[PDB]
Amino acid sequence: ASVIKPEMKIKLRMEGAVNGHKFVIEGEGIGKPYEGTQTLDLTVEEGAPLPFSYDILTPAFNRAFTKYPEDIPDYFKQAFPEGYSWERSMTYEDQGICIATSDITMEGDCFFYEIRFDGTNFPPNGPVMQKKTLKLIDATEKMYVEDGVLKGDVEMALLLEGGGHYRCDFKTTYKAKKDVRLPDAHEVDHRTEILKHDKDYNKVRLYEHAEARYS
Numbered sequence: 384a385s386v387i388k389p390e391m392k393i394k395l396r397m398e399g400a401v402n403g404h405k406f407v408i409e410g411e412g413i414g415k416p417y418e419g420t421q422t423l424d425l426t427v428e429e430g431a432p433l434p435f436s437y438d439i440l441t442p443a444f445n446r447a448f449t450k451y452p453e454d455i456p457d458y459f460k461q462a463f464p465e466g467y468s469w470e471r472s473m474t475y476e477d478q479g480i481c482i483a484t485s486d487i488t489m490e491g492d493c494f495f496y497e498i499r500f501d502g503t504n505f506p507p508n509g510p511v512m513q514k515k516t517l518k519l520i521d522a523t524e525k526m527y528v529e530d531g532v533l534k535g536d537v538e539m540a541l542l543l544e545g546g547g548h549y550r551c552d553f554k555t556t557y558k559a560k561k562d563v564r565l566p567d568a569h570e571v572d573h574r575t576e577i578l579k580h581d582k583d584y585n586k587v588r589l590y591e592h593a594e595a596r597y598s
Contacts, residue, residue: 441519576591
């Protein structure tokens, strides 16, 4: 949508709690919506230092930053300037669970996210609470229309120290704030990388590259 410029700024605030630990993280960044790329600088403002793996947070920190082919309707870019929200359930293989939501709006050349993140039931000696995850493994999200909105299903894994995979299934519901042309079922490939961080991850620079396709 012509309101989506080739370069868009980002500002965000996340409030949440994981296994009883409350925290607030804010972020500023910039990305290229039509290239599917974005970089965020994230700062823990309350609850530092986080006692849990930062990798459970990174997909919560905007599918407007997805390269969409012209023959797949772009649910996310169509939704602006009004915007959209998303709601996400995440279930980890050791029964840790998370619920995250985001309300995404836009003013001028900047997106604004209001993010909520809640997680619980992580085993206190498991890889999340012991910060034993290395990264998110590249994953594919299956997008499909249901109940008049776009949904995405993901079976992905975090890489653990020692090479094990730590599996998480999540399901996201994406809700445009106005009617848009709904796409047929498709896929979004994600690559997610923490580019840099300070010692306690109070400061994190986070990158994503995402592209939509069929098959």
